[PDB]
Amino acid sequence: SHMASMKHNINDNTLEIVVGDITKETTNVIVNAANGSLLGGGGVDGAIHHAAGPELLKACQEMRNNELNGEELPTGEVIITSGFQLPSRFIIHTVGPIWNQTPDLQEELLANCYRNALELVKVKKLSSISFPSISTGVYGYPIHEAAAIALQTIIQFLQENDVGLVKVVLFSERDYSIYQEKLKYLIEKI
Ligand SMILES: Nc1ncnc2c1ncn2[C@@H]1O[C@H](COP(=O)(O)OP(=O)(O)O)[C@@H](O)[C@H]1O
């Protein structure tokens, strides 16, 4: 099947948007739009658990019990695990905002997912990362607004930092089309 894609170079970095299944990406890191409980759900988190195999859930729950001391992973924060059966080396787990639960903070919190994940890529001297459309499925964040926040945040980070390749993997042509129109718009302002 055809997979729409476009790329833009930002200094020595490359930002790519693509249609695809994030579990098939061979980037160093893939990002899971995780649940706060770090339990496996449906959606992209469910896909990632199914593709990674049963060691993922076990790893995440060990991390919940130890470094998080039974607390939920806070919105906009990150943890990192191995990739297990995924073709990536690592999975960065992040929790996006649930749409309009916290209206005053949710733009910042969504941005935090991207910023915190990208800083962690830098810290570990990894050079490629794939993001899904965080919060625009069951979490209900309007795709038109989320895409703006995701892209602005990524573009800003890549303007100030050497990372390598950042991919956003969209699961539908509609989401890709929105991302494409937003990315083209933001490129024009640079
Ligand atoms: N295998 C997959 N690869 C990439 N994206 C996916 C996959 N499965 C679902 N998605 C997309 O991930 C986005 C977030 O959906 P969801 O998993 O419900 O996350 P959230 O709970 O953060 O909204 C949605 O656009 C959904 O279509």
Numbering used by the authors: -4 to 185
The study reports:
The crystal structure of OiMacroD-ADP provides new details about both the mode of ADP binding and the role of the β6–α4 loop in this process, in addition to the data shown in the archaeal Af1521 macrodomain by Karras et al.. Interestingly, the OiMacroD-ADP complex showed two alternative conformations of the bound ADP molecule, in contrast to the single one found in Af1521. In the first conformation, the ADP fitted roughly in the same way as the ADPr in OiMacroD and the ADP in Af1521. However, a detailed view of the pyrophosphate showed that it remains slightly distorted. In this case, the β6–α4 loop was completely closed, as expected, over the Pα and Pβ, but lost some of the interactions established with the pyrophosphate, especially with residues V133 and Y134. In the second conformation, the ED map revealed the ADP molecule to be bound to the protein only through the interactions with the adenosine and Pα moieties, whereas the Pβ is projected from the active site, remaining exposed to the solvent. In this alternative conformation, the Pβ lost the rich network of interactions characteristic of the ADPr complex, essentially presenting a snapshot of how AMP could bind to the protein. Surprisingly, in this second conformation, the β6–α4 loop remained closed and fully packed, due to a main-chain H-bond between the Pα and residue V133. Taking these results into account, and the fact that no binding of adenosine alone was detected in Af1521, AMP seems to be the smallest portion of the ADPr molecule that can bind to macrodomains, and is specifically recognized by loop β6–α4. This fact also highlights the essential role of the interaction between the Pα and V133 for AMP binding, which acts as a trigger to induce β6–α4 loop closure. Thus, the β6–α4 loop seems to be able to recognize the AMP moiety even when the Pβ is absent.
Macrodomains are ubiquitous and evolutionarily conserved modules (approx. 130–190 residues) that recognize ADPr derivatives in their free form or linked to proteins, including ADPr, PAR, ADP-ribose-1″phosphate and O-acetyl-ADPr (OAADPr). To expand our knowledge concerning the field of macrodomains, we have characterized Oceanobacillus iheyensis macrodomain (OiMacroD), the first to be described from the order Bacillales. A yield of 40 mg of pure protein per litre of culture after a simple two-step purification process was obtained. Its phylogenetic analysis revealed that, among the six different classes previously described for macrodomains, OiMacroD is included in the MacroD-type clade, together with other previously characterized MacroD-like macrodomains, such as hMacroD1 and hMacroD2. The subunit has a mixed α/β fold, similar to that of other nucleotide-binding proteins, composed of a central seven-stranded mixed β-sheet (β1–β2–β7–β6–β3–β5–β4) and five α-helices.
